[PDB]
Amino acid sequence: PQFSLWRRPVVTAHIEGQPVEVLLDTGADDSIVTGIELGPHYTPKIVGGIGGFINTKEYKNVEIEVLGKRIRGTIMTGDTPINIFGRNLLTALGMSLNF
Amino acid sequence: PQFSLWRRPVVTAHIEGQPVEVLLDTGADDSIVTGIELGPHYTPKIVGGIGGFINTKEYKNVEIEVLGKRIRGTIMTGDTPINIFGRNLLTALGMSLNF
């Protein structure tokens, strides 16, 4: 199936059974969400975006449900204005940029 | 043809005949580049990214060459750490997010 880019390629994912709205975003190496609690077990980060950097909490082998797929993968949590699924999760999902 | 997301979907565009390396990025509404002079004729902006906002110069019906296509479209210029072609230019280019 497909996403044409006339609208934001936005979707609903359950991370550990909580549901979040994420933008599928080719331009990110990682995936940052806010709004969900992933717990105690993390290594911190610093991510760079357009206008600065933010402080995030890095979580590995995290349960993700999205597009009728069950995936395990790394997610960061922090100060993001929008939730993104970066290229790390799109490779896993089997996605391509077609033209 | 296609971009699988194992590598950054990066490409070379000529904006007004100058060549720039751009990341095709689904997660942007617009396209911001730095490094090129587009001239005097602009309306300013403020774009929001992850960590803040930046100040940009908005240019319309700008000549773009990329992927053996000649396109006209809006580009912003400013403080971007990476050059991006947002969803505004990918619709024009005939791109889709396939899975």
| CATH number of the CATH domain containing B72 | 2.40.70.10
Asked if A47's CB is within 8 angstroms of B49's CB, the reply is no
Rounded Cα–Cα distance for residues B96 and A4 (Å): 5
CB-facing half-sphere around the CA of A19: CA atoms within 13 A? 4
Residue whose structure tokens are 């979580």: A59
CB-facing half-sphere around the CA of A97: CA atoms within 13 A? 26
In single-letter form, the type of residue at position A59 comes to Y
Question: Which structure tokens are listed for B55?
Answer: 């100040």
3-state secondary structure of B20: strand
Q: Which one-letter DSSP state was computed for residue A40?
A: S
Q: Which one-letter DSSP state was computed for residue B15?
A: E
E strand or H helix at B82: none
CB B57 within 8 A of CB B44: yes
Tell which residues of chain A come right before a gap with C–N over 2.5 A: none
Tell me the sheet residues that pair with A62: A73
Which is it for strands A70-78 and A32-33: parallel, antiparallel or unpaired?
parallel
Rounded Cα–Cα distance for residues A27 and B8 (Å): 8
> How many structural domains comprise chain B?
1
**What are the CA-CA distances from residue B91 to residues A8, B44, B96 (Å)?**
11, 23, 8
Tell me the sheet residues that pair with A15: A18, A64
Backbone φ and ψ for A27, nearest 5 degrees, come out as -85, 5
In single-letter form, the type of residue at position A39 comes to G
**What are the CA-CA distances from residue A74 to residues A71, A90, B21, B55, B87 (Å)?**
10, 12, 28, 32, 26
Residues in chain A: 99
The answer to whether B45 contacts chain A (CB < 8 Å) is no
- List the domain range (segments joined by +) for residue B82: 1-99
Rounded Cα–Cα distance for residues A72 and A60 (Å): 8
Closest in B8, B53, B94 to A51, CB measured: B53
What is the experimental resolution, given in Å to one decimal place? 2.3
Asked if A93's CB is within 8 angstroms of B99's CB, the reply is yes
Q: Which method, experimentally, gave rise to this model?
A: X-ray
CB B96 within 8 A of CB B26: no
